[PDB]
Structures are given as structure tokens and as C-alpha cells.
UniProtKB/TrEMBL annotation, chains A, B, C, D:
Name of the gene: NA
Catalytically driven reaction(s): Hydrolysis of alpha-(2->3)-, alpha-(2->6)-, alpha-(2->8)- glycosidic linkages of terminal sialic acid residues in oligosaccharides, glycoproteins, glycolipids, colominic acid and synthetic substrates
Protein name: Neuraminidase
EC number: 3.2.1.18
Listed cofactors: Ca(2+)
Membrane topology: Single-pass type II membrane protein
Enzyme's top EC category: hydrolase
Keyword terms, alphabetized: Calcium, Disulfide bond, Glycoprotein, Glycosidase, Host cell membrane, Host membrane, Hydrolase, Membrane, Metal-binding, Signal-anchor, Transmembrane, Transmembrane helix, Virion
A GO MF term: metal ion binding
Main location: host cell
Organism of this sequence: Influenza A virus (strain A/Duck/Ukraine/1/1963 H3N8)
Keyword Cytoplasm among record annotations: no
PTM per Swiss-Prot/TrEMBL: N-glycosylated.
């Protein structure tokens, strides 16, 4: 039976911890995949952590990282949420240097992307077997969310980006039933830039938070109805949610256009509470260190700067990174709504630390109806390892 | 279907061994979690061993133990009873520096506790996904059993402690259905101190044995009816069941109040045989070395000193530690009653041994209708390891 | 539903290989349990390999073997047939320095034995939870088969030995339904000695082949009807099936009494083909080197010396050891009979080799209706390992 | 229920990647089986990777490879497609130095081959338990596909070769229901040589592509109707699909007889698109380096040289090896046809590289209705390892 996901996002006052896998700490002696870009999606029975590999291990010479990023040794694997990405608990998903994965009630539909950048290919597995494919339409680095995709009523929706990373690129919306592509749509958002979207189900539509690697220190926002009609723009909030960014006060904000004349970005998430927003960001405005999350009143609909709450999960004394969204099925939480949960990546090693490798651990948090305290649940490992 | 647990405790004449995992022996070469505070609960299909991690491994530098105890790297994981807590057989349960876990017939309800000590948070997972939360009400080290919780007819009951460890603290009783808190109650036991309760189902009520870290070398006792009405006090027995303690003869005992003017404690268990008690304790009265268990006649209802039986499981030549209670489901043992089974932790390393780490192995015993012989099933490993 | 096992043994002309786990070869780098006394039983869905542990690993210091044999660190674990006994694929069964395990159609009933030799205890687990116990009746090393037990129609039968190993001891027959002992019987076989029986289902009865560690180079034989009435004696065959033994020609044989004035023994198996026997033995008559199996015509009913076939599985250039019996469920093989299959242990290290440890690998063979060729499927590892 | 496999092969314009396991890269630190001859078959729920072992590990001394190839330590194990062949995720299948494995909808029927070359034995396991056997009929190296076998409507068909490798040998066709041999047939193909067939279901019949190790640089072709009536010969295409081979232009081709006066061969696959063929081969015509696949128009029925498409998967800068066929069940892909998917082995070490061992990793590709780009998904590991 198809997992409904038609209900609304739960109004939450805070986030209680879900998991922590300590893989880089475990991987000092264990057999752990050097991973990058973990993310969580849930089936109506369990939540798993996806990630990308080089087919290497921590403390190995194959973790030397000189081995490139967009590589053929790159695969998508999954483990259960909280388990580390180890060799002996991993489930193979796809050959992938960029991915998204999602469940619809029956089977897992994964979409890993590979090939050369000129003509990259994205394969849609479903039930484990590849079912369909999407080819590079623009010929510049075909890619997708790196976070959970979204199925509503058995139809799974997601967002891909073909084009350049700095200048204007092209952005699309795909739609599948049982791993077979049933629809697609182009995103006529000009001047704007959409990357690495964090998305979720909300009142029968798909809301996705994204990253502007062109000109925006604020974050793009897409709204997707199941007929692929769309409204797009930016998170109206007067708080810069991207990184690098500037001061909150030297920032006005816009619901339509990119603000803050900085380049670059980072993957980030947001959650729409009626008219308010749960926005997440790093503490450092220039680095990826720390992580915090703020509820900004009327920040979804207005260029607001009203911080209702400010909860800290990763301290600015510690390294973080990417972040993304997902929901808890009704068939799991017991609610009448969809519990907003999220993950934060914590990057260790290169380029910041004196090592030869680059991996990440995660912490997952999810939406509660109470106020959670500020603490730091950070990575832990004591670098450099023996290999370095 | 909800696991009944309304029946009475089996009258047992002894305890036959259930398991032994030898993880610290296995972990000389294997990949084993440096754990602390293991405990056993059973579903109507299997019994699992819970424990807490630092995300470290035996023989790793991450086992250096200087890494603190109430830490963010602390998680609750489980394995099957008898299996060691290894990376490749572990199931993630919660981020936890203090825990309890229990099954009700359908899903596992875990309750791990984390955060800062000032405002610690306890998350209730159920089916794997967090379902509810309890926040620090007193602002001093929110904590819970470290042993199995108890579900009766689909409602799961447990005991938490907010306050100080030496002086008077505050003690509460929680109640859940499907991971959603449905009740709570304060414990008006003054002068008394309740920590780390070992509990069980008995005639439709929950009996919990606890630890007095204030003034008692005897053990607190709580009786919980499913409406959260309670009687509380001490195990009436004239035998000191806590550690450190004194001689049995320089001990009178009380059914209401703390006896033996020693501080500190250790986690310990007891089992009520009609009017008698199966009480467990270490052999050494000052250290945690050894383990033994005595049936004291009428010791549940009277300040008795009549040892009916004395069975030894861990010898005073060997190290032990915590201990706790649980039952076997009717859906497993085949009985008409609930088989009393228990686990003993065996601590190796710091603070007693010349190492840099601290972990534990366990042995599990359960209630038989025969007299079992005295032997020592101890830890085994030959310390220090190579890392030290 | 209860697995029938009322049918007869398949008449087989040879044995085709089932498995080989190469654990000692795998365990040069892997994480493999130093085991002793492996054996195979099958459920109506799969066959597993049982074994006993010290909680040590190959190449570990904990494999030093000075660590004794009848030890508390001794456990019974299982893996699938062909898989090695590794830490990460092992299922905990019991604390055991002597064991038997069997399935009846619904759950696994294990019987591991432990304690001190004076008052050893045998616990009956069933479904994973201990269900019943048998205590030392004679006070000298309580022990059992080390090979599969036998369930017929939901009742499981086996053979235990309390007494001395050299002189006359005492031998019993137990019977269980759902892990609860429902019957027992003493074996009034005087002068004779019964150890480590290899048993099986045959026409509604249980036939067990055993070892005479007193005075016999031939092998005891027990026949068990499900009311525990018994006929006992020796395998009538004029071929000595035990080891150490003598020449076949300096051996007459007896269907009642022990022949060949040698002491000691080894665990061994046999299979009754109507009136013939498939008897197995080592090639060396003094050491445990090699393994071969001979069909002796009318050897079950008469003191025959007619070798119908002689198949070799382990060559006399290579080390072997114990051996034992089991059947394939109809629910697996598809037959109308019960396929005779067997395992051979291959011991490496101490006492024969220049190492510090002692483990074993296995090969499994089962009954086919064709003539299989003589080859050597031996252990493989290249000793001594790095630890030595 | 029996998996139908009566439908036709999907007409495909290209192949999108299925998996990559990077075991030799993982096995720099992990526990990975030194394997040879991997292959993929799928059940109506999952696809697994089969392989053969020495019971050794990467980076072990037991990987020294001086240990021979046709050895008793040789086993057939399986893992899921994309997972590496590691000790802790492996399922034991058979003792095998040559194999085939296939699923019919209900259980796995494996056929591993062992023994001495003079009188080798092939055992048919089914459901895990050995069910039947085929003995060496010619007395020279009994062997089979090393690739997936084929079940159609519950009857499983495959191809064995008894005889010599260079000169004329003998070739047979077997047929099983539930692991019990129900039919057999001799292949009266004279002058011709058939080895290591890659086969598949196509319109109710079994088409198998093979290797000519005698005189052919082109590839034999067998067509099997379920009554074991056969047509046999060669892939009519004017393109040499074997290796070593010669130029395409110095090659005429034949639909009946072996062309290109070279000896040797390599395992290879083909797929019949109505009248066209998807033929695969290495890039190097003399070595096993590289891999590419060409659709040759009317190449199944005519000595054509019309390359419709040329897709590259492994570049000639990198090592490859064997290759073989299989299908995706309708119960997996969702199609009305049978999706043509294939695997390529990538050999590292001896005999080409400066190591002491020999293993392989794989990539799997499957049939899509789009044109896939040329990229290299190669092995990765950086040789020699530490052991060498
Ligand atoms: C901005 C979106 C893409 C465009 C190529 O760049 C991602 C940026 C980025 C970062 O550090 O911020 C890491 C991401 N990333 C992904 C990876 C691999 C290792 C290929 O998975 N390495 N880096 C970029 N995504 C790619 C290369 O496909
Ligand atoms: C007396 C109850 C608590 C109050 C903080 O102290 C526990 C005592 C204790 C011991 O050695 O006896 C070990 C327990 N403990 C638990 C832990 C960790 C590693 C945090 O799980 N370390 N020690 C204490 N529980 C805590 C700190 O939450
Ligand atoms: C003859 C039957 C028993 C009587 C104690 O002796 C077994 C003999 C034997 C051998 O080498 O032949 C190995 C068996 N054995 C078993 C074990 C352990 C390691 C205790 O499982 N070590 N050796 C003996 N069984 C025991 C000690 O319980
Ligand atoms: C040509 C078919 C057979 C005839 C013996 O030879 C296979 C050739 C071959 C190669 O390199 O091309 C590798 C194959 N092979 C297989 C193996 C083992 C390690 C026995 O599985 N080693 N090599 C050959 N098959 C055998 C020996 O049973
Ligand atoms: Ca930006
Ligand atoms: Ca105390
Ligand atoms: Ca003897
Ligand atoms: Ca050739």
C-alpha cells in the first residue's frame, strides 16, 4: 500500500535527537566507508542513512582523497539511521556521485547519478533493480538533491540541476511511479540559482529548500503540486540562511530574488510552520563550523526577522556541513501529521584539518512539541588518524 | 497484540545461565564497542542486550576513557543476548548517556537521555522513531534505570531521577502507550534516595528494586499499580544488599527507612518470592568484586535474616558491577508465570586495573525450579591490551 | 507444525560435498572464533553449524590455549552451514563446554552444559530462552553428544553421560517437548562405555553411534523408541570404527561387547542401510589424520567384513578429528526419506602442530544415489600464524 | 510460485550501470574474499553476486595464489549485487571450483563442481541442501558456465563441458525441477568448441553465448527449447567477439563454424535483439584490457558488420576480464519483457601486475531504452597492497 504523505507538517517547538553514528570514531579501528553527503529518508517501517562512497575505508591508503570526487568508484549505499556506514551493514543502492533516495510505501526508489560530466547519466532503481534513466540535458554536471526525495500517494518527486555552479544553470522537476518516470518540468527561475534541495511533504505539495551558489546568501524555495505546476523564489525571511553569508542586520531579504552579494553556498534546509519558518544554518557565517536552527515568525510569507526560538545543536567550536530534510511516516510516529526531522553532516579532515582524507559523521534531530536545550552533539574523532 | 505480563513471578530455587558474550575477550582482535551499563529486556520473540557507547572500540585510542562519561558521543545500541556489542551486529536505539528499553508485544519503546546536565532531555523512541520527550524538571542530571523497563498490557512504566546523587533528589514515575506519554507521578519518599531501579512485572503491578546513593546500604523498593498509585520504602530484609555496605550482623534492616550509615551504592536487583526475596549483591562488601545471590525468607515483608539459599555466580577473585532485572514472556518460556532472569556486569580496566579504558562484559541468569551450583562465570580478558 | 522425521534413512551409494568454511584460512586476517567440536543440524528451512567458543579469536593472545578447555568462557554459538564461525555472523545459543542442538519444526532446542565438573548443569534453551535444566546426577563431568540431537514428531531425544571417561560411567536418555523435559531413562549397559553419540532418525526410532573410551576400538550402538525403551550394544561389524584401533584382520567384532583392547576413542558416526552400515573412521589407526567411509555389508546385523564401497574425503596426509551425524528434512530435500549427511572436524595446531592454539574447520557431506570420487577436502591454513 | 521467464528480451539502446562493489579497494583494510569468476543472477526479489573462493582474504598470506586454482578450498558463495564478497555478508552456496546458480521463483538452485579432474563431481543444491549430482562423464575437468543459469517455468537449464580445453571436448545440456535432474542432452557440435556459456531467456527458449578455446575468435551459440532440442553454431556476425582475436576487417564471420585461426578465449556474452546482436568484448584484441559493447545489425542471423551503436564501459587503459548474461524478472522491473543485464569482471594482480594474488571486482550494467555515454567504471585499487 502506498504511503499517503498528504498531511501537514507538525508544528514543533523544538528538535530532540534521533541518532549519532560516530563512524569516524568507530572507524579508527573499524571498517567504515569514507563517505560524503549522508542523508535520511524513512520508509513506513524504518529510516535509513544514505551516503556516497569511493569504495575506500577509514585509515586506508585508499582514503588518500587525492582520489577525486566525481569518480567512477563512487557508489550510493545505505545503512540504518544511527548505524555507521560500515562494510558489513551496508546495502548497495547505486553507482553515484550524486543522489537522492525515497520510499513510497512499497519499495525504495533510488536515483544515483554517474558518468562523465559532459554526458552524465542518472539511473532510477526501484526495488533494487534499475527501472528508468534520465540523461544529461545541458551537458554540465548532471546532479540532484543529496537529500531525501518525496513520494506522495505513490508518486515520487525530485529536483535536478544541469548547468554551471557559479553562473546561471538549468533546473528541473521529475516525477515517478514505481521507478518509471511519468512526468517532468523545467524551472523558469531566471537570475536565480537552485542547488541541492532539501524537500518535504506539506499539505499535498512538495516544498523544497535549496542552495544558491551564484549570488544568494539567502535560500531559494520551490513549491510543487503533483501536476508539476510550481511557484518558486526565495525564503522571504530577512535572515540569511546560506553560508557564506553576512550579518543579519546588513541583510534585508526577499521572497523573490537573491540577496547578499556573496557567492558559494552550502546545503541547507528549512521547514514551513504555517507562516513561520524553521531555518537552519551554521554558526560561523564564513565557515561551516557550528550549527543552529531558528524559528522566524512569518518568515515563510514575509521578509521577517523575528526569531521565535534559537536552538543550538553543533557548537561553533566544532565542524559541521550539509543539512537536509525529511519526514516521519504516520505509520511510524503515530501522529496525524508529518514530523519534521533533519540531519547535519559534520566534516572532518581535508580541507580544514591536517589529514589526507575527507569523511563525515552525522546527528539526526526530529520535531517535538517541547523546547529542547542547546548542547553540542559533535563528531568526536581525534585527528589525524594513524594513516596520516 | 500486546504482551500481557499480568501473571506472577515464578517461584524459583535457582538460576541457570542464559548467556555470556566475552566481548572484551573477543575485542582483543575484534570490533567491539567499549560499553558501560548493559542490560537485558525481552520481546515475545527474543531477548536483546542494550548498552551505551562512546562510539569507540576496544584497543582504539578512542577508548582512552579520558573522553568523559556524560558525553555527546554517547549512544544507546542493542544486540541479541549473548552476542557481543560489536559494530556489525548492533542496532541503533538512541543518543543516550542513560537509558531504559522495553518491548510491549508490538514495538520497542526506548528512552535514552541526553543533553547538558542542567537541562537534559529524554527522548522516547518507539518503532525506531522518536515519539515523545521528557525534559529536566529539576536541572540536575536527568536519568533513568539503566535496566529494563516494564510494559503491562501495552502500557510501559519506568522510573526517573532528577536531582543530586548524594543529597536528597527527586524521583518520578512515567507511563506510556505506543511511545506517547500518557501519565506521570511524583515520588514523595523523603530522606530516602532512589537510583537505577531494577524492576519487573508481578501480579499486575510493577516492582522495582533500586539504589540508595545517599545514606542506605539497604535497598529502596517501589510498588507500582497501573494508575500510578504507589507504595515505596525499603526491602525489609535484615541483609544489606547495596555496596558499599557493612556486616550482615551489624545490620538490622528496615522496611521503611535507609539503614547502614554508608554512602554510595551500586546498581542491584531483587526478586519477590511471595514473601521471600531473591536478593543479589557483590561478595566484597566494599568493592564490586564477586557476585552472589541469596533467597531470604520472608525478606520482602519482614526484617528477616533467614538465608534459604546462597548461590554464587561471580567469585570474589573476579570483578563485577551493576545488575538488573527482567522477565521472560509467556510467549517464550511456555510457562504460566513470568520467569525471573537477571544480568551482571563485569567491569574491567579503569579505575581498578592498569589500563586506559573502561568496558564491561556480562553473564545472564534466569529462574529455574532446581538448585544450581556455585561456579564463576567471569569476564576473562587478559589485561592490559595492546593499546595500553 | 512439527517436523515429522518418521521416515527411513535413504539408501545411498555415496556422499557429495555440502560445505567447507575455511575459517582457519579466513581467520588469518578475519575475525573467527577459535572453536572446537562443530556439528550440523538442520531445520525445515536451513542447516546451521554449531560449535563451542572460548570467546577468543584466531591470531589473538586469547587463543593461547593455555586457557583451559572446560572453562566458563565457553559458549555455544551457531552459524549457517558453510559460513565460518565469525563474530559478525554468529548467533548465541548457550554457555557450554559440551552441547547438543536440534530443531523440531518450530524452534531450536539447545542443550549446553556448564558449571563445575562436580555439579555441572545442563540448560535447555528453546526459542532462545532457557526452558529447563538437568543437573549432574553422578558428579563426574556431565556431558552430551557434541553432535545433532533428534526430534521426531515434536519430541526431542538425546544422550548424556555422567561418570568417568576411562572406567565405567553412567549413561542416560532424555526426552523433551518444547524445551520442557517430559521423560528420562537410564542405560543398563554394563562393562560398556558410551560417549559422544552421533544419532539420527530411522523408521520412527533414534539410532545413535557412539564412542568407547574405555576398552573398545569398536563402537557402541543405541536404538531408541519414543517410549524410551532401548536396545544397546555394539556395531556388529568386524571392522574397527574407533580410533585408536588395530588392524581390521586382528579384529573379530561383536554386536554386544567391546572389542580391541585399546583405550581412548574419537567421536565417530555410522549410518544403517537396512542391514548394511555406512561407517566412518580416520585413515590412520593411531592418529586422527585422514578420513574415510566404508559401506560394510550386513554390518549392522552381523559381524561382517564385507566392504561394499570405500570413499575417501580426507587424506592421510592431512589432519582430521571428530565426526557426527544428521538428516535432511523432507521439507528441504524433497525426498520420501531422510538423507544421511555428516560432518568431519579437521583439527589444526596443538597438540600436533607448532602453535599455541587449537581450532578446527569442517567439511560436510550428504547422501547421494551415485558413487562419489575420492578426493581430499582438507583444512588449508598454513601454520603457524603470526600470533605464534 | 514459479517465475515465468517466457517473455522476450527487451530491445535496448543502451546500458545504464547497476552496481560496483570496489572490493579490492575495500579489501585494502577490510575482510574481502579473494575471488574469481563473479556473476549475477536475480530472484523475483533481489539480485545476488556469486563468486568462487579459496577461503582466503585480501592482504593475507593465504592469498599467495601459489595456492592453486582447481583446489579443495574452493567454494561458491554469494552476496547481494553491489556488496563486496566479504566474510560477514556472505552466504554459503557450494564447494566449487566451477559453478552456475539460478533461481526459479521459489528457491535457489546452485550447481558447484568439485573433486579431482579425473572424476569431478557436480552437486545440485536447492534451498541450500544438496538435491542431486552429476558425475564426470569423460574424465577431463568437469565444468559449467561461471554465469547465471536459466529457469523457465520452474525448469532450470544449463550447460556443462567435459573434455579438453584446447582440442575437441564434449558438451551437454541439463534440466532440473526443484534441484532434481529431469533431463539431459548431448551436443553434437563437431570441430566446434563450447566453453563458459552466457545464457538467458528469450521467447520461451534459452539462448547461450559461449567461448571457443580451440580455434575460434568468434563465439559459439546455442538455442535451447525446453524439450532439449537444440540448434547450435556460431554468432553469425562478422565481428570477432572473443579474445584473443584479430582485426574486424581480417574477419569474415560464420553462422556455423569457427573463424579466426587463434586459440584461447575469454568468457563473453551476447544478446539477441530480434535479428541484431548486442555483443560485448574487450577493447584490446590480445589482452583482457578494456571493455566495450556493440550492437551489430542483423548480426544474429547474418554475417553482418553493421555497428549500430558502440558503448564503452571499461577503458583500454584498465584491466577487465570475464563477462556474462542474466535477466531481470518481470516481478522486479515491471516490464512486459526481460531486461538484458550483464556483468564484467576486472582482474587485478597476477599474472599482469607485480603482486602475489589474483582477485577481481565487477560492474553491472542493464538494458535501458536510451543511449548511455561512454565512461570508465574500472576497479580502482592501487597495487601492490601491503601484503606484497
Ligand atoms: C554546488 C552544487 C555542486 C555543483 C557541481 O557542487 C557540490 C558542492 C559541494 C560543496 O562542497 O559545496 C560538494 C559536492 N560534492 C559532491 C561530491 C562527490 C564526492 C562527487 O559526491 N563532492 N562534492 C558538489 N556536488 C558534486 C560535485 O556533484
Ligand atoms: C548514582 C546515579 C548516577 C547519578 C549521576 O551516577 C551513576 C553512578 C555510576 C557508578 O559508577 O556507580 C555510573 C553511572 N554512569 C553512567 C555513565 C555513562 C558513561 C554516562 O553512561 N557513567 N557512569 C552514573 N550515571 C550517570 C553518570 O548518568
Ligand atoms: C571422552 C568424552 C569426554 C569426557 C570428559 O572427553 C572429551 C574428549 C575429547 C577428545 O579430545 O577426545 C574432547 C572433548 N573436549 C571438549 C572440550 C571443550 C573445550 C571443553 O569443549 N575439550 N575437549 C572432551 N569433552 C569434554 C572435556 O567435555
Ligand atoms: C577454458 C575453460 C576452462 C577449462 C579448464 O578454463 C578456464 C579458463 C580460465 C581462463 O583464465 O580463461 C579460467 C578458469 N578458472 C577457473 C578457475 C578456478 C580458480 C578453478 O575457479 N581458475 N581459472 C578456467 N576454469 C577452470 C580451470 O575450471
Ligand atoms: Ca550562497
Ligand atoms: Ca548505598
Ligand atoms: Ca575406543
Ligand atoms: Ca577463442
Amino acid at each position: 500500500t502506498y504511503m499517503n504523505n498528504t498531511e501537514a507538517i507538525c508544528d514543533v517547538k523544538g528538535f530532540a535527537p534521533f541518532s549519532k553514528d560516530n563512524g569516524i570514531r568507530i572507524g579508527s579501528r573499524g571498517h567504515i566507508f569514507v563517505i560524503r553527503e549522508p542523508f535520511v529518508s524513512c520508509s513506513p517501517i524504518e529510516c535509513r542513512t544514505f551516503f556516497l562512497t569511493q569504495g575506500s575505508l577509514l585509515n586506508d591508503k585508499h582514503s588518500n582523497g587525492t582520489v577525486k570526487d566525481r569518480s567512477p568508484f563512487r557508489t550510493l549505499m545505505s545503512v540504518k539511521v544511527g548505524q555507521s556506514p560500515n562494510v558489513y551493514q551496508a546495502r548497495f543502492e547505486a553507482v553515484a556521485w550524486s543522489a537522492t533516495a525515497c520510499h513510497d510505501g512499497k519499495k525504495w526508489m533510488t536515483v544515483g547519478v554517474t558518468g562523465p560530466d559532459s554526458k552524465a547519466v542518472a539511473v532510477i532503481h526501484y526495488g533494487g533493480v534499475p527501472t528508468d534513466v534520465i540523461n544529461s540535458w545541458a551537458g554540465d554536471i548532471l546532479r540532484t538533491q543529496e537529500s531525501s526525495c518525496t513520494c506522495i500517494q505513490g508518486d515520487c518527486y525530485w529536483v535536478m540541476t544541469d548547468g554551471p555552479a557559479n553562473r546561471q544553470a538549468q533546473y528541473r522537476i521529475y516525477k515517478a511511479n514505481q521507478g518509471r518516470i511519468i512526468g517532468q518540468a523545467d524551472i523558469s527561475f531566471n537570475g536565480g540559482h537552485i542547488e541541492e534541495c532539501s524537500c518535504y511533504p506539506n499539505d499535498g505539495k512538495v516544498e523544497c529548500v535549496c542552495r544558491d551558489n551564484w549570488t544568494g546568501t539567502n535560500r531559494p524555495v520551490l513549491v510543487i503540486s503533483p501536476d508539476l505546476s510550481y511557484r518558486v523564489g526565495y525564503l522571504c525571511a530577512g535572515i540569511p540562511s546560506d553560508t557564506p553569508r553576512g550579518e543579519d542586520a546588513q541583510f534585508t531579504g526577499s521572497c523573490t530574488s537573491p540577496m547578499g552579494n556573496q557567492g558559494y553556498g552550502v546545503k541547507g534546509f528549512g521547514f514551513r510552520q504555517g507562516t513561520d519558518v524553521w531555518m537552519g544554518r551554521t554558526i560561523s557565517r564564513t565557515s561551516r563550523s557550528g550549527f543552529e536552527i531558528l524559528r522566524i515568525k512569518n518568515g515563510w510569507t514575509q521578509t521577517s526577522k523575528e526569531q521565535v526560538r534559537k536552538q543550538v545543536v553543533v557548537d561553533n567550536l566544532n565542524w559541521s556541513g550539509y543539512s537536509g530534510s525529511f519526514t516521519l511516516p504516520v505509520e511510524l510516529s503515530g501522529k496525524d501529521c508529518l514530523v519534521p526531522c533533519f540531519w547535519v553532516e559534520m566534516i572532518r579532515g581535508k580541507p580544514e584539518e591536517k589529514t589526507i582524507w575527507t569523511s563525515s559523521s552525522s546527528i539526526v534531530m526530529c520535531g517535538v512539541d517541547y523546547e529542547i536545550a542547546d548542547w553540542s552533539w559533535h563528531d568526536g574523532a581525534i585527528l589525524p588518524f594513524d594513516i596520516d
